[PDB]
Design an enzyme around this catalytic site. Structure first.
Site, PDB file in Angstrom:
ATOM      1  N   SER A 151      -0.002   3.851   2.479  1.00 27.24           N
ATOM      2  CA  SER A 151      -0.428   3.063   3.631  1.00 27.24           C
ATOM      3  C   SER A 151       0.515   1.892   3.814  1.00 27.24           C
ATOM      4  CB  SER A 151      -1.862   2.578   3.460  1.00 27.24           C
ATOM      5  OG  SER A 151      -2.787   3.629   3.657  1.00 27.24           O
ATOM      6  N   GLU A 201       4.618  -2.595  -4.916  1.00 26.66           N
ATOM      7  CA  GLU A 201       5.732  -1.661  -4.861  1.00 26.66           C
ATOM      8  C   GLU A 201       6.962  -2.242  -5.536  1.00 26.66           C
ATOM      9  OE1 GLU A 201       6.226  -0.423  -0.680  1.00 26.66           O
ATOM     10  OE2 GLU A 201       5.110   1.360  -1.297  1.00 26.66           O
TER      11      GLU A 201
HETATM   12 MG   LIG Z   1      -2.806   3.289   0.335  1.00 25.31          MG
END
Ligand SMILES: [Mg+2]
Ligand SMILES: Nc1ncnc2c1ncn2[C@@H]1O[C@H](COP(=O)(O)OP(=O)(O)O)[C@@H](O)[C@H]1O
Ligand SMILES: CC(C)n1c(=O)cc(N[C@@H](C)c2ccccc2)[nH]c1=O
Length: 764
Positions: free
Chosen positions: A229, A453
């Protein structure tokens, strides 16, 4: 448990059977000998002591190695009755390998959820387990944590029980890296409340479709997840005073708009571009002039165009139907396809240098004609305005001729901006549905930010999402360790402050404060002759050697160039500065945006209706708006753990799991539950709820102070008088005592009603 028959076929994946329980209690075990000992390749291994040399211990591991370790560093195993137990706060020894091996042993039997005292840990199965069927939704309804096995449906209902009892807004704060399970667990919370409101429909189905509609345009394949996402999301599920579902709001925070025109190798653009193409859908590939395979539409063709985990033809119809159920009209749904079609053509436009002028001209115009047709523009005015924009400086107007490289940038910036504004519109259009004007009093806010990330190339968007994760961790840290212990001292409980070391404000100040990294960006975008190397110099001068979390980059060979390194909570992240001033300022060509406002396509004119406030500044204030509103709620945390990098099911790597348990403060969060007083009730609310346990303790009609009533009542129950403490206005309960008092309340509610029923026979 014999009651597990109500969970049907899901039961082996929620509790071990009594057949397995009797094997657990019959294991050979010596409490003096069985221990955990550390190891290198996997963080801790079970071991058996074989000799003692005072402060030195020597042991034989589960893999038959001999080891020697100091007595401070070798930790006793829990006895086998604590195999696979559902709440790790109830262990006798609580340490790192007790939490590691309890999770690993539950996950190895596909029991993926576990409680951790006040919060829950979820370990990602790469396998769809049957535990999410609507019979299991029915099986969780109204059960307490003492009764039902841990599940995301349990957390949802527990938050729902607090919402109705405390009359306070609740939040479910789901947290984890990329690939952890954050998005599907969000969807299951949303599934739970919808199906419960259906078991009591149009709003229930529309709320369910709101996720896959946004996933088409907002999710993308990335190296860590095939369905990452690229936007943060906060969902407020609203309930009435009676507790039935009444509305939902979706809010979204920062879409990774650069992905629309640029992708790294080994990752995709957004799913929408590839799913239109891969079905070869006759209506869409003729209406959108996108007849080809994906490798020739430049914006989407880089990276990877096919992914084995996603059958884009079936996902197309799933999201096409999602917009149908959300009531996007035929012209709207076609229009938002048209803009995605135009963006594909808009990246193919070719420009060349005029022979002497240092000025761009269009090299090929067929792809501009396709773009202008779909966008309802005029192609001649489009190409003129893209190459020769009017800029105004007060009343003075001048044409600046663009160079070939900077008209290409201008097409990129426009393509990003159409996509971003269309995604924002779609969210507001989804929130035009779901708001049903039914009355509401409370909400449960489900949060699914973009998770943490570390790519091989981290940029300004990777800074924004990693900053957003760090703030939400400090929300957990402040709630669990700071604000919790302030209340003990405030209410006058006998507590001496424990420093858990879980604090991150040094690295948030490095980013937020008015001399920090983002605060330099908001002024370095203002100076017109600033450059990215000017920024990097000023960034280092302010912070290198003056903040401990700001470090020089550690460029290893083969990986790309990075210009500084941050010591985030979840790991060191190395950031590349190129383009950040442009990305932060976001200058669009105002002439072509003037053509967009005059577009014949009703959508495109709407997107740019009404277009200092740089995107870092907007992000920081949206995130500060969020967490001030989030502090006005009771938070429930769900720690999503990715067990394994290779996405293979049931495989679990101990170092990668332990890294996530450490940096999420999971062990500390349990320890404050065991040491502290995690449950607490005002004396007025305590008397209101629990007088039914002993109505003779607090005779009413006489006046009595609420403190004076509750102190008498608690001694008469024959619960352990050491398990509670009295503050100035709250009683404070140890970990398990509220769970005992609720069970005592429900059996006494059952006893009185059956005797009311007995009297209803006795009158006859
Ligand atoms: Mg996600
Ligand atoms: N509870 C679960 N049951 C089955 N599969 C899951 C579960 N959680 C995650 N997965 C697998 O991992 C994928 C990625 O999880 P997702 O929630 O999209 O990651 P993120 O934490 O990055 O949002 C899912 O699409 C699925 O393949
Ligand atoms: C989490 C904690 C601080 N807490 C409690 O410990 C008890 C609360 N309220 C009582 C009245 C209650 C009892 C049983 C179920 C729900 C609520 N609220 C709370 O917020």
């Amino acid at each position: 448990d014999s009651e597990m028959a109500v969970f049907g076929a899901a039961a082996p994946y929620l509790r071990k059977s009594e057949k397995e329980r009797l094997e657990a209690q019959t294991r050979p075990f010596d409490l003096k000998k069985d221990v955990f000992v550390p190891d290198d390749k996997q963080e801790f291994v079970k071991a058996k002591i074989v000799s003692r040399e005072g402060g030195k211990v020597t042991a034989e591991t589960e893999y038959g190695k001999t080891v020697t370790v100091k007595e401070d560093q070798v930790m006793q195993q829990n006895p086998p009755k604590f195999d696979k137990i559902e709440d790790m706060a109830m262990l006798t020894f609580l340490h790192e390998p007790a939490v590691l091996y309890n999770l690993k042993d539950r996950y190895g039997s596909w029991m993926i959820y576990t409680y951790s005292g006040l919060f829950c840990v979820t370990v990602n199965p790469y396998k769809w387990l049957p535990v999410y069927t609507p019979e299991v939704v029915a099986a969780y309804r109204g059960k307490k944590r003492s009764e039902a096995p841990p599940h995301i449906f349990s957390i949802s209902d527990n938050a729902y029980q607090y919402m109705l009892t405390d009359r306070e807004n609740q939040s479910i704060l789901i947290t984890g890296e990329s690939g952890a399970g954050k998005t599907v667990n969000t969807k299951r919370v949303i599934q739970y409340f919808a199906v419960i409101a259906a078991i009591g429909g149009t709003l229930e189905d529309q709320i369910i479709q709101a996720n896959p509609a946004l996933e088409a345009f907002g999710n993308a394949k990335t190296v860590r997840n095939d369905n990452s996402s690229r936007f943060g999301k906060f969902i407020r599920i609203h309930f009435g005073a009676t507790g039935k579902l009444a509305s939902a709001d979706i809010e979204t925070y920062l879409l990774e708009k650069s992905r629309v025109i640029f992708q790294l190798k080994a990752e995709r653009d957004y799913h929408i571009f590839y799913q239109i193409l891969s079905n070869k859908k006759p209506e869409l590939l003729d209406m959108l002039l996108i007849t080809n395979n994906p490798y020739d539409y430049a914006f989407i063709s880089q990276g990877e165009t096919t992914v084995a985990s996603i059958d884009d033809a079936e996902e197309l119809m799933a999201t096409d139907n999602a917009f149908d159920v959300l009531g996007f009209t035929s012209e709207e749904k076609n229009s938002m396809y048209k803009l995605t079609g135009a963006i594909m053509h808009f990246g193919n436009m070719k420009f060349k240098l005029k022979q002497r002028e240092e000025q761009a001209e269009p090299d090929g115009t067929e792809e501009a004609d396709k773009s202008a047709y779909l966008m309802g523009l005029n192609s001649a005015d489009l190409l003129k305005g893209l190459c020769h924009p009017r800029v105004k400086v007060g009343n003075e107007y001048v044409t600046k001729g663009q160079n070939v490289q900077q008209v290409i940038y201008a097409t990129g910036a426009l393509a990003k901006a159409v996509y971003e504004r269309m995604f924002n519109w779609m969210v507001t259009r989804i929130n035009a549905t779901l708001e049903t004007k039914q009355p509401r009093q409370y909400f449960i806010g489900v949060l699914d930010i973009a998770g943490f990330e570390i790519f091989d190339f981290n940029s300004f968007e990777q800074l924004c999402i990693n900053f957003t994760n760090e703030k939400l961790q400090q929300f957990f840290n402040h709630h669990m360790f700071v604000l919790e212990q302030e209340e003990y001292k405030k209410e006058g409980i006998e507590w001496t402050f424990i420093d858990f070391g879980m604090d991150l404000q040094a690295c948030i100040d490095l980013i937020e404060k008015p001399m920090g990294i983002m605060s330099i960006l908001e002024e370095e975008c203002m100076f017109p002759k600033a450059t990215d190397m000017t920024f990097k110099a000023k960034l280092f001068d302010n912070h290198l050697g003056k903040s401990a979390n700001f470090q020089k980059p550690r460029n290893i060979k083969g990986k790309p160039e990075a210009h500084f390194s941050l010591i985030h909570y979840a790991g060191i992240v190395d950031y590349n500065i190129i383009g950040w001033l442009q990305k932060n300022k976001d200058p669009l060509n105002e002439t072509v945006v003037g053509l967009y406002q005059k577009s014949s396509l009703k959508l495109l004119s709407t997107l740019f209706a009404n277009y200092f406030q740089t995107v870092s500044a907007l992000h920081r204030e949206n995130l500060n708006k969020l967490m001030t509103n989030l502090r006005s709620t009771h938070p429930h945390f769900v720690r999503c753990i990715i067990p394994n990098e290779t996405k293979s099911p049931g495989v679990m790597d101990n170092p990668l799991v332990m890294h996530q348990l450490r940096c999420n403060g999971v062990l500390e969060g349990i320890r404050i539950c065991r040491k502290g007083f995690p449950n607490r009730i005002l004396y007025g609310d305590f008397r209101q709820r629990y007088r039914i346990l002993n109505p003779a303790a607090i005779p009413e009609g006489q006046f009595i102070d609420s403190r004076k009533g509750a102190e008498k009542l608690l001694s008469s129950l024959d619960i352990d008088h050491n398990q509670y403490k009295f503050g100035h206005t709250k009683v404070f309960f140890k970990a398990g005592l509220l769970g005992l008092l609720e069970e005592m309340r429900d059996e006494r509610l059952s006893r009185i009603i059956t005797r009311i029923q007995a009297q209803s026979r006795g009158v006859l």
